[PDB]
Structure formats: C-alpha cells, structure tokens
C-alpha cells in the first residue's frame, strides 16, 4: 500500500482532507505523489512531451542520460509538469511522472464576454517566462479552441482550458523552456488579483491545526 512519510500524507490517507484545494489554500508543499493519486486518481492523463538525451564529456567518452518531459493533469482545472533526468528512459519517465504529479497546480478558468455556463478561457492575460521563452495567454471567445503551438496546446488542453489565444517570443524550439513558460503562465492564473477576489479573506483552520489531535493521537 502506501505508508505516509509526511504529516500531510497521513492526514490525506486518513480521509480528513476533503479536497486538493485545502492544501492549495494553505500553500503546503506536496512531497508524496500518493496524495495526488488519492485526490485526482484516474482523472489524471499524462503524456511525454520530449525525451532529450544529454551527454557529459568524460575521459573515456560521453556519459549519456535521458531527460523526460512529462505533462499531467485532468482536463478540468489541474495541470502539472515534471522533468527528470536518468541513466535510462523508463526510470526518467517514472520520475518525471512523479514530479509532474507533485507539481500539479490549480488552474483558474474565466469568461471572455458574457458569463454563461462553465468558465472556458483564462480569466485575463497572463504571461509565463522561462529562459527567454515568453508565453502569453489571452482570453478567447467560446468555441475558438486553443490557438497555440503544439506544446502549449497540449499543456492548455491538459489544464482544461477550452479556448485561448497564445503569443510566444524567444527560442521556443527548446521544448523544455517552452513547456515551463506555458506552465508558469497557467499557474499565474490563480495568483492574479481580479476585482472579484477583492472580498476580504476569511481564514479557516489549517489541516495541521484542525487535525492536530488526530496527528498526536498516534
């Protein structure tokens, strides 16, 4: 099975964290991928964006390792991206899947014009940057689809963004920086202070405080 190593993992396994949004609310770090496996479960669909073989020069020759770029996420508002480099492709893929699970962030969806139905696009213009690669996401009308390059399109579809406008600048040919910039732009959606979020924050008890008695009762 799974023996939790962290307090958060123990709270999640003993069915007292209702949703993944509590941990996001209290900004706690996820160090066990089994928490994400417990909350998102079978809704998560991962895929390998790229396997980049990187070589280190040695006296005998070149030492080759393979870096796996993996994007994961249910198509409903959660997306993650994980990069792991290993001596073998299968190990790198497993590690990148674990890291992408650990890096899952909540995605905020919005409306382009009239607010009818479920939110379909990004709430506003967001920009992500990773080593000269700038990715800009612009709200798009319903039914537009993702107007983007294949890598940002894959990440945005995995994030559940129905339709979006995209701009890119810099060496987007480097898939890792392109994907990381898209992930940064996607994760900036919930950090953006819009007027609908001006309402004063009402604090609730932290999972570590609200369930401290259960933690110490062991």
């Amino acid at each position: 099975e799974w023996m939790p190593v962290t307090k958060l993992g123990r709270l999640v396994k003993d069915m007292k964290i209702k949703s993944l949004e509590e941990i996001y609310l209290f900004s706690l770090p996820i160090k066990e991928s089994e928490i994400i496996d417990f909350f998102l479960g079978a809704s998560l669909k991962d895929e390998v964006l790229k396997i980049m073989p990187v070589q280190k020069q040695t006296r005998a020759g070149q030492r080759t390792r393979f870096k796996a770029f993996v994007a994961i996420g249910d198509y409903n508002g959660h997306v993650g991206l994980g990069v792991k480099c290993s001596k073998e492709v299968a190990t790198a893929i497993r590690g990148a899947i674990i890291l992408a699970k650990l890096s899952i962030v909540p995605v905020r969806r919005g409306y382009w014009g009239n607010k009818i139905g479920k939110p379909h696009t990004v709430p506003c213009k967001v920009t992500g940057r990773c080593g000269s690669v700038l990715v800009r996401l612009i709200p798009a009308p319903r039914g537009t689809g993702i107007v983007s390059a294949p890598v940002p399109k894959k990440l945005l579809m995995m994030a559940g963004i129905d339709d979006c406008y995209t701009s890119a600048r810099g060496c987007t040919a480097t898939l890792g920086n392109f994907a990381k910039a898209t992930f940064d732009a996607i994760s900036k959606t919930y950090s953006y202070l819009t007027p609908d979020l001006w309402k004063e924050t009402v604090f609730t008890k932290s999972p570590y405080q609200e369930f401290t008695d259960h933690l110490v009762k062991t």
Binding site: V48, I51, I93
Partner: peptide, 30 residues
C-alpha cells in the same frame, strides 16, 4: 522490438530520428 531499448541504444546513429518516432508512439499518441 522494444521501442525504449532501441532509443537507448541507437538514438545517436543514422536511425536516431526514426527510433525517436517509434519511441514516441510507444509512450503516447506521438
């Protein structure tokens, strides 16, 4: 023919490009 093994062996040969394509097919819908 293991797509992963072919990639780990001769990704840096004349067949590296086609071997990469076969690897991407095995992993995802690439």
């Amino acid at each position: 023919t293991d797509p992963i093994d072919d990639f780990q062996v001769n990704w840096n040969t004349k067949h590296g490009s086609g071997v990469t394509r076969e690897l991407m097919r095995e992993l995802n819908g690439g």
